[PDB]
Amino acid sequence: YFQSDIAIVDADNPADAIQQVKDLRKYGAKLIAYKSKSSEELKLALKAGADIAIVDADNPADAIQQVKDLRKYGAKLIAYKSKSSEELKLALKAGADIAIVDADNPADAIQQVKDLRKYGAKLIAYKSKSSEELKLALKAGADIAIVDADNPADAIQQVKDLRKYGAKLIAYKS
């Protein structure tokens, strides 16, 4: 939370969210991201002191509505995650700031990064337990490296490795 630029919360309920935000906010974390399938929960998280609202909606119609609800509410940093680069572009066209690439497949995921970079996406994020795959995503034009290690030791080493490589924005999921 010191070496990382962004702290990502899942917390499975609102009251956990406003508590987990308050924990991070007072003690360590700089930028706080919160993910939810509920735009109303995301609004509460932002009010509680989160910086980045990650829209988690599985269907494009719901995603566009949620991005627009958060844009009107005054959200400053809206992110959307999809396995579809078409759907990520829909979220950018609705006013999302951050496209999070989430293809199940390193070849495919790295191509989504190139396609989003070609498209002109301002901020692309990429998640991996492979620090070497995160370096390939950054060369391909990703801006945010999301560490996804299976334990604390591997997470701490991924952050160190990506700093030395030159990663400007590193995110960690608690």
What CATH number is attached to the domain comprising 22? Answer: 3.20.20.70
Q: How many independent structural domains does the chain possess?
A: 1
Give CA–CA dist 26/44, Å, rounded: 18
- Would 92 be classed as within a structural domain? yes
Give CA–CA dist 14/93, Å, rounded: 28
Solved by what technique? X-ray
Q: Give, in order, the Cα–Cα distances in Å from 42 to each of 50, 67, 125, 138.
A: 9, 11, 19, 28
| Domain containing residue 137 | 6-173
- Would 101 be classed as within a structural domain? yes
- Would 130 be classed as within a structural domain? yes
User: What DSSP element (H or E) covers 17?
Assistant: helix 14-27
Resolution in A: 1.6
Strand partners, 169: 144
Which long-range contacts link 154-158 to residues 24+ away (Cβ below 8 Å)?
Answer: 154/129, 156/3, 157/131, 158/129, 158/131, 158/134
- Would 1 be classed as within a structural domain? no
- Would 123 be classed as within a structural domain? yes
Q: Give, in order, the Cα–Cα distances in Å from 65 to each of 54, 56, 74.
A: 13, 12, 14
